[PDB]
Amino acid sequence: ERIIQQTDYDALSCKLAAISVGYLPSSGLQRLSVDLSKKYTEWHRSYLITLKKFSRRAFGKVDKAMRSSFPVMNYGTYLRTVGIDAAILEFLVANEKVQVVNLGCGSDLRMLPLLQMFPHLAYVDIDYNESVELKNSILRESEILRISLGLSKEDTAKSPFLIDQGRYKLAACDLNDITETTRLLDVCTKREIPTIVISECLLCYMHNNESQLLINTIMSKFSHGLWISYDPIGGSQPNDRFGAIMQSNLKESRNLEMPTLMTYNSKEKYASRWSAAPNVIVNDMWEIFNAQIPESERKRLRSLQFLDELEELKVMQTHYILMKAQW
Numbered sequence: 001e002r003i004i005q006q007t008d009y010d011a012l013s014c015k016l017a018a019i020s021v022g023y024l025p026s027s028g029l030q031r032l033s034v035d036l037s038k039k040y041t042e043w044h045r046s047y048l049i050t051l052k053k054f055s056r057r058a059f060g061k062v063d064k065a066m067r068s069s070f071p072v073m074n075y076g077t078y079l080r081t082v083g084i085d086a087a088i089l090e091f092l093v094a095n096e097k098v099q100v101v102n103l104g105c106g107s108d109l110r111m112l113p114l115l116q117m118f119p120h121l122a123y124v125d126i127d128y129n130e131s132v133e134l135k136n137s138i139l140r141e142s143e144i145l146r147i148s149l150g151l152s153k154e155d156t157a158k159s160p161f162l163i164d165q166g167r168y169k170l171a172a173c174d175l176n177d178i179t180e181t182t183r184l185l186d187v188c189t190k191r192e193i194p195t196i197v198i199s200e201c202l203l204c205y206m207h208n209n210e211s212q213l214l215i216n217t218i219m220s221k222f223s224h225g226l227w228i229s230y231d232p233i234g235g236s237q238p239n240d241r242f243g244a245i246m247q248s249n250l251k252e253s254r255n256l257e258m259p260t261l262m263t264y265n266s267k268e269k270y271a272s273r274w275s276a277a278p279n280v281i282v283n284d285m286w287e288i289f290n291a292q293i294p295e296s297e298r299k300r301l302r303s304l305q306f307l308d309e310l311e312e313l314k315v316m317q318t319h320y321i322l323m324k325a326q327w
């Protein structure tokens with residue numbers, strides 16, 4: 001569905017706006033060296049320039065969303081990124097030979113530093129065909145992104161892969177299709193390798209059956225791993241209209257659905273979807289802001305923009321969660 005696929009333009013605008021202002025990279029929390037901090041920005045900057053080459057319409061959407069970002073959104077984007085990153089880094093530091101499967105990867109570039117930083121990491125990006133065709137175009141067209149992946153400019157990979165360049169694979173898959181998904185995994189992952197699964201604003205676009213099948217099945221495919229999921233929740237307090245508001249706004253604006261926003265309207269209900277994993281941690285992004293963000297970062301963020309409305313931040317961030325499931 002082309003509607004769902006374009007929710008990536010929102011995710012990308014947000015990523016890009018946070019880098020522009022200077023929220024990211026956070027070299028401390030993302031564990032970026034001097035050169036990788038520089039590259040982080042340079043890679044995202046080229047990604048936007050190269051997107052422009054491939055799609056005027058895409059670029060215009062991304063561009064206007066960036067210009068109109070507000071501090072509360074940049075804090076959210078920062079929290080989302082460092083929170084996932086912190087979960088990933090802890091596991092990769094502890095587990096040398098690891099595979100990362102990034103489900104609904106959109107324009108995510110976290111592989112670029114991760115692959116450098118962790119010599120024995122293998123990483124697999126998975127999104128709809130149309131989305132991964134565009135990502136493959138940008139990655140190969142841009143000289144700096146090609147170099148970062150050791151890629152050639154001529155797409156030289158065999159279906160099911162658009163990129164199959166050593167420790168990185170970019171592959172198309174409809175994740176509503178469990179058989180296509182498990183088939184795809186059989187040829188790019190191994191059962192016995194500690195596996196991190198990332199679903200960052202992916203499951204929110206899925207019907208409960210499809211998302212629960214995908215959760216169960218993927219967890220069953222690997223002896224051990226960690227699922228890191230980030231998503232909104234509709235919110236459980238009485239008279240909390242966040243979910244209601246969000247669903248209505250997406251249906252009127254984009255014809256877009258978030259089928260289980262109200263079903264998983266709190267962190268505990270959300271986390272319960274990984275009840276097969278022995279170790280489930282769940283926090284809303286406000287809790288992350290208070291628990292994981294050092295005072296040095298809080299001070300560095302204040303230097304960049306005026307967050308005049310901290311309570312507005314808190315309200316939004318209590319409606320996003322980071323779930324960590326380990327088996």
Ligand SMILES: Nc1ncnc2c1ncn2[C@@H]1O[C@H](CSCC[C@H](N)C(=O)O)[C@@H](O)[C@H]1O
Nearest residue numbers: 005008011104105106127128174175176200
């Ligand atoms: N059924 C499905 N199969 C594969 N990709 C899907 C999918 N449903 C949604 N997606 C992908 O999920 C992404 C959500 S936008 C999130 C992008 C990225 N994970 C980030 O946080 O920046 C879009 O790229 C969309 O195409």
